[PDB]
Amino acid sequence: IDLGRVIGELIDHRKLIISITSVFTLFAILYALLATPIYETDALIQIEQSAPETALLQSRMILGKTIDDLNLQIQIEQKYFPVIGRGLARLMGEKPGNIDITRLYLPDSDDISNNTPSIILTVKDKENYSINSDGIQLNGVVGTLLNEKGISLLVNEIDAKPGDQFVITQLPRLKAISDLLKSFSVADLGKDTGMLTLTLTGDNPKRISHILDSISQNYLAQNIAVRIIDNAVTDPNPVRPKKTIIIVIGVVLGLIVSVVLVLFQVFLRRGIESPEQLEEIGINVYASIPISEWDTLLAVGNPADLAVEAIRGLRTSLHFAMMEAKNNVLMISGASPSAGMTFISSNLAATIAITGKKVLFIDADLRKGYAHKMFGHKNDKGLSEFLSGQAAAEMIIDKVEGGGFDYIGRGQIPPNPAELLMHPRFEQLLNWASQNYDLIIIDTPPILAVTDAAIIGRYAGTCLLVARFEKNTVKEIDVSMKRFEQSGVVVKGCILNGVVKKASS
Amino acid sequence: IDLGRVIGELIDHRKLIISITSVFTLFAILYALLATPIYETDALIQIEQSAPETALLQSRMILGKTIDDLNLQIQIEQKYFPVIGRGLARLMGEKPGNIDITRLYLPDSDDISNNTPSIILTVKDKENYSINSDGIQLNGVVGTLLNEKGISLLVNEIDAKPGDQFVITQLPRLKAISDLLKSFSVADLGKDTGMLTLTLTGDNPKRISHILDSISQNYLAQNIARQAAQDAKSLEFLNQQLPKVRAELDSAEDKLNAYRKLNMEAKSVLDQIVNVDNQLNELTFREAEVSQLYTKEHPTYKALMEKRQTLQEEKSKLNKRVSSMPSTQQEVLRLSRDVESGRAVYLQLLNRQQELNIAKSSAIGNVRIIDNAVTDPNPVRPKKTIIIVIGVVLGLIVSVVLVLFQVFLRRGIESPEQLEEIGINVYASIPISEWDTLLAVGNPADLAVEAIRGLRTSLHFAMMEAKNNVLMISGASPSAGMTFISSNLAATIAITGKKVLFIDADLRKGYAHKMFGHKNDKGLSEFLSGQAAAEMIIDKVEGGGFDYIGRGQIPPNPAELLMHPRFEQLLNWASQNYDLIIIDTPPILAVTDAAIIGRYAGTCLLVARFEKNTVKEIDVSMKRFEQSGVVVKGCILNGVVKKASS
Numbered sequence A: 001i002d003l004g005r006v007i008g009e010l011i012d013h014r015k016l017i018i019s020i021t022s023v024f025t026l027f028a029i030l031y032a033l034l035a036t037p038i039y040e041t042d043a044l045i046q047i048e049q050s051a052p053e054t055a056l057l058q059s060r061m062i063l064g065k066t067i068d069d070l071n072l073q074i075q076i077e078q079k080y081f082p083v084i085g086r087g088l089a090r091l092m093g094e095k096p097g098n099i100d101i102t103r104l105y106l107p108d109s110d111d112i113s114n115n116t117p118s119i120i121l122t123v124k125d126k127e128n129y130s131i132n133s134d135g136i137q138l139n140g141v142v143g144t145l146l147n148e149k150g151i152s153l154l155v156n157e158i159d160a161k162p163g164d165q166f167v168i169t170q171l172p173r174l175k176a177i178s179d180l181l182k183s184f185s186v187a188d189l190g191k192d193t194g195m196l197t198l199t200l201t202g203d204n205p206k207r208i209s210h211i212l213d214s215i216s217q218n219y220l221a222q223n224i225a226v227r228i229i230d231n232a233v234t235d236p237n238p239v240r241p242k243k244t245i246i247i248v249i250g251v252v253l254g255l256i257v258s259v260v261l262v263l264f265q266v267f268l269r270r271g272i273e274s275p276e277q278l279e280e281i282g283i284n285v286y287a288s289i290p291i292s293e294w295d296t297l298l299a300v301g302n303p304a305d306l307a308v309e310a311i312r313g314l315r316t317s318l319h320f321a322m323m324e325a326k327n328n329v330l331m332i333s334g335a336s337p338s339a340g341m342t343f344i345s346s347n348l349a350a351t352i353a354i355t356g357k358k359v360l361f362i363d364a365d366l367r368k369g370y371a372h373k374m375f376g377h378k379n380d381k382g383l384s385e386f387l388s389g390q391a392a393a394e395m396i397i398d399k400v401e402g403g404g405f406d407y408i409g410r411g412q413i414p415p416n417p418a419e420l421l422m423h424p425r426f427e428q429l430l431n432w433a434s435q436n437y438d439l440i441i442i443d444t445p446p447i448l449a450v451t452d453a454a455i456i457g458r459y460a461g462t463c464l465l466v467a468r469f470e471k472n473t474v475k476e477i478d479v480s481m482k483r484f485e486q487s488g489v490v491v492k493g494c495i496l497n498g499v500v501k502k503a504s505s
Numbered sequence B: 001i002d003l004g005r006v007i008g009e010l011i012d013h014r015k016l017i018i019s020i021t022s023v024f025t026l027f028a029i030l031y032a033l034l035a036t037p038i039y040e041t042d043a044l045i046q047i048e049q050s051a052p053e054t055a056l057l058q059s060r061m062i063l064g065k066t067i068d069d070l071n072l073q074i075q076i077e078q079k080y081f082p083v084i085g086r087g088l089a090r091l092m093g094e095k096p097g098n099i100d101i102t103r104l105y106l107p108d109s110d111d112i113s114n115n116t117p118s119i120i121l122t123v124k125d126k127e128n129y130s131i132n133s134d135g136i137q138l139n140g141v142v143g144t145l146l147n148e149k150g151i152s153l154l155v156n157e158i159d160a161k162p163g164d165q166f167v168i169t170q171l172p173r174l175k176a177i178s179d180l181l182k183s184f185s186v187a188d189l190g191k192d193t194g195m196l197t198l199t200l201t202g203d204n205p206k207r208i209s210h211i212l213d214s215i216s217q218n219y220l221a222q223n224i225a226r227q228a229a230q231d232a233k234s235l236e237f238l239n240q241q242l243p244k245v246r247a248e249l250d251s252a253e254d255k256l257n258a259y260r261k262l263n264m265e266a267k268s269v270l271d272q273i274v275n276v277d278n279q280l281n282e283l284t285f286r287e288a289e290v291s292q293l294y295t296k297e298h299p300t301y302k303a304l305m306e307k308r309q310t311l312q313e314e315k316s317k318l319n320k321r322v323s324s325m326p327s328t329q330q331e332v333l334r335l336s337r338d339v340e341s342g343r344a345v346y347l348q349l350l351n352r353q354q355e356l357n358i359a360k361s362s363a364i365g366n367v368r369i370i371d372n373a374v375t376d377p378n379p380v381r382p383k384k385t386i387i388i389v390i391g392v393v394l395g396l397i398v399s400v401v402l403v404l405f406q407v408f409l410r411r412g413i414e415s416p417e418q419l420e421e422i423g424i425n426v427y428a429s430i431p432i433s434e435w436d437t438l439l440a441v442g443n444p445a446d447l448a449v450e451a452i453r454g455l456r457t458s459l460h461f462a463m464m465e466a467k468n469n470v471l472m473i474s475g476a477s478p479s480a481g482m483t484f485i486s487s488n489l490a491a492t493i494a495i496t497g498k499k500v501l502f503i504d505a506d507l508r509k510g511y512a513h514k515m516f517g518h519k520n521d522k523g524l525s526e527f528l529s530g531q532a533a534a535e536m537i538i539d540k541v542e543g544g545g546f547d548y549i550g551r552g553q554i555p556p557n558p559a560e561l562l563m564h565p566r567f568e569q570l571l572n573w574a575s576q577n578y579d580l581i582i583i584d585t586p587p588i589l590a591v592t593d594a595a596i597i598g599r600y601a602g603t604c605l606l607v608a609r610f611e612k613n614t615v616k617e618i619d620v621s622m623k624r625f626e627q628s629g630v631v632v633k634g635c636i637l638n639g640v641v642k643k644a645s646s
């Protein structure tokens, strides 16, 4: 391979790459701007060793004493319904509220799994509030204690707007100790000094400072029954999330996934890409019709389109190729349906009729042909009604309105098309028409699907295949060529279709 | 190779890969949701070194003391019949029951292998229960002790629904110590500090906490005993008492020797009394030590006194039972009682002396318990997420390797390119027909009939300039499609207004007359043998349009019949009255009928099954036709299916 190919592929798939990278970067931005900030506080302790003290600091005794002092077993959570309500509330400048609780005791349901009882407190005003545990609504007031239904609760100094809601959970002492220990760290930083650095990470900038101060005071008072060089202070800059690295990771991940997806798509495409592939095998590509961005003939509605120019080029190629042929019958066929046989054949008939030569257009697609729909029709007495013998050769031929060439529609769909096409009346029709017209163009069904094309091809002076740009493959075209060879029909060449401009070319 | 091939193979075998991965993931889910949870408890000990203490913690002395304290030698298992009953019971929210047992003693069968006696206790209500050891059913009640058939049992506070069953095993002390030590671990975590982390893993969240607490308390009390031992008179008391007990033991031994120079019930009650005496002596020592180091109102002391009362009750019952026995055995029973009691007390006092020396020679001034044992509510095993990930990855791996094995073990044809490489013109490729009647008649618009019409158009040009109008369809292996292709082709050529004759020259297993509607008399055999004319053999297909000649009766010498010149006369006569003659033949790799017939055939075509036959078989068939003087025009693939790997 070469760099030109990969650059062309990247340029071609720029839209997909940009879209994927943009969506990944947007997700990264949302996460980095909605994640709850996590502040870090630290303290410095002088030890008058330091390994046993490091192990003893994180013992459940000291942390439990601190939790009992600060009532860390009463979890209060401001309630936002979604997973992003807190982030947007912080972004909108909304001030988070807080409630000071000094006494809580829930009935302690203590089922198999949920060992943590919880209630919901809704703020009604600055003074009173509502409590619901399992739908049981009660009214309480700040100040006076509440002792009802096995629930004891004391509220002091509630600071929030009315209508706010808070989840109040009485989690077990061990769970609170584990939570505190999970975010609390100790280091020596000298490996021999009396200096110990204590670190605590949490989302409340003042609560973590108070907690670490309490931990240090408890440790010092326990030992005195060691000096605090630096009382705990909180860094105002959050340590998580790190927005810049998150955005960089998002952008890089988007680029990587876009690149690998583009590589997968490139290595999984098999369709034709240029007439060079067909010319390698030994097939003369007679044209390359581009896609027409424009139920009427393109060669009539928009005679100056690019596709009609390509078809005029094909007409000039044919005027020399179709010399010294045994007769003046051209058969346009294909490999797979919806390739362009009818489009190419009809437009070519129009472009050859506009030059003053009489043209006949036969729609021998007795299975799904719709030429009469595209030309304006008297659908009676098609090709079928002639082949079966219930019509003459004169009532089948009609005139296109904006064309200039005659046509013979299929007519009624027969039950035995391929068995009809073998009738000698078909050859009689072609022989009669060849003496009254300058050109006869026969449209046929695919050859990979049915065998009508190979039956008709015996009486065709020239035969041309039509290959779709991206859909068909070189293998399909080669198989079609060989299947025409076996049946005794010599294919002149191919005609690419549906071409679009690709930067990788 | 290329990535396209492997992607195509994966897409083709998506069903197998998905099935295998799904079943493996289901098994992983079942294991991760049915495995018994294992909780972990831990404790933190301060050492006032730490390597000798690490070795001493896991010594049999401390663990044995803990087991004797907590009666860990009485294994109680809730009974579920299957290997998954416990998991589903836990999943269904069923509350597991428990029984508190303070005294158990089984008859101790003690055979060659099963040194662990066991019984089954079935819950009948909140109060009474049933006991079965080897089918012997007994009824007991919580509270009142049971002492029957050499079985002593005490039950307190049974909490389960009636109808539950429990296996009660009295496993040996050493086995219990090994089980406890297997799941118990100690670490230093500082390599120099006095901090030791003790870990214990078990399935009962409270029992493991109690066990680890007991271990820590025993270790601390053993270490601290030094301070309350140097001045303790227990040292001299033991130093004086031991010679007396040894002298008594020697006297009992001499008396037993003198009396010596085997009743099952007698020996059983002897062992019962020996056990009771051992428990009483050890309980007396434990009560003394607890009264020294604890208070009477402490629940442990009350447990000791109730156990002592129960032991006294059992001793009274055993004494009554002895009083019910003849004195001739009672004398030997008393002698054995004295000897065994002396031995047990001697060993117990030796242990007391050794433990006292252990305490006195203790160097650590005071070991402290920083953190009493607590249990993590989140189980440490099984780890569900990693189990599921491993299951999914294993399923993917086994599916991939199986697909690779199948891909590298296939040899059949896959595309007409393989046959065209060797130099064989593949004239068609008939797809499989998802639809005992001709396909070209029942469903004339099927894909296979379209492919056969393509073959007909190919033949109409191939069969030109041939020496006559006879076509011979043959094959390599049976059940390839010779009759299917030949009959359908005859139908599709007859529907175009050309007269067709169909000869079924498969004189061994031909069934054309079955598929066409038959007058089975006067087949091909009856003509070749000479017992029929050329006119009674030809019949008309009903929904066809072509004549046919069935095989008829199976002859004993088919290949020797086909060499008769009357066969050539028949073909020459038929060639002047029909537009086409199609002859079906048996395979050529199996028999030689095809090569005999092929001399008079203008055109010959082989039929190759898609996946079954191989390029080698087709080449061998071509060469075997060449040797016999028959020129094969080409091949016809059959049974084609759409494969993504193409």
Ligand SMILES: Nc1ncnc2c1ncn2[C@@H]1O[C@H](COP(=O)(O)OP(=O)(O)O)[C@@H](O)[C@H]1O
Pocket (backbone or CB within 6 Å): A289, A290, A291, A292, A293, A307, A334, A336, A337, A338, A339, A340, A341, A342, A343, A344, A497, A498, A499
């Ligand atoms: N170069 C082209 N530009 C725009 N539309 C095309 C082109 N070629 C074919 N088509 C359109 O795509 C459809 C399939 O082509 P058509 O020839 O009618 O079917 P078939 O190949 O099976 O006979 C048609 O509706 C046709 O108008």
Ligand SMILES: Nc1ncnc2c1ncn2[C@@H]1O[C@H](COP(=O)(O)OP(=O)(O)O)[C@@H](O)[C@H]1O
Pocket (backbone or CB within 6 Å): B430, B431, B432, B433, B434, B448, B475, B477, B478, B479, B480, B481, B482, B483, B484, B485, B638, B639, B640
């Ligand atoms: N393309 C096909 N689609 C569906 N069934 C087929 C096809 N080809 C053969 N068979 C069926 O499989 C069986 C074997 O084919 P057959 O020609 O009758 O045996 P043999 O090849 O030994 O003479 C037959 O029952 C036939 O109907």
Ligand SMILES: [Mg+2]
Pocket (backbone or CB within 6 Å): A341, A342, A365, A369, A443, A444
């Ligand atoms: Mg068409």
Ligand SMILES: [Mg+2]
Pocket (backbone or CB within 6 Å): B482, B483, B506, B510, B584, B585
């Ligand atoms: Mg057969």
